[PDB]
């Protein structure tokens, strides 16, 4: 039992090091994403041209379909309804 607990504690140390590696790298990726967003904002006329929490977990083709479906339902024809079914 002490052998099992020692080996499982070493496995938990390796898993905590992996979670920290994921987090560090993940944080760096998030920072890069923020910079990209800032660049997009800079690139961004706009003045003349001027549900979500469930759509946070959609697949990207499903997310594009959801955005286009809500845009077409609010834009031209109001006889359209969408719903997200799953777990």
């Amino acid at each position: 039992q002490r052998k099992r607990l020692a080996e499982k504690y070493r496995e938990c140390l390796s898993n905590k090091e992996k979670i920290l590696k994921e987090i560090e790298v993940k944080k760096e990726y998030l920072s890069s994403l923020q910079p990209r967003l800032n660049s997009i904002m800079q690139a961004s006329v706009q003045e003349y041209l001027f549900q979500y929490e469930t759509a946070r977990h959609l697949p990207p083709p499903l997310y594009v379909l959801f955005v286009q479906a809500t845009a077409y339902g609010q834009a031209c024809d109001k006889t359209l309804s969408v719903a997200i079914e799953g777990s």
Binding site: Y48, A71, A75
Partner: peptide
């Protein structure tokens, strides 16, 4: 009147695109 009729559909499409851009701007 023809310019306003074209600018209505142009503002609709650009408003969909600007709604996507504003959602991206509020996201980041």
């Amino acid at each position: 009147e023809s310019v306003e009729d074209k600018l209505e559909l142009r503002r609709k499409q650009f408003h969909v695109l600007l709604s996507t851009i504003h959602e991206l701007q509020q996201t980041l």
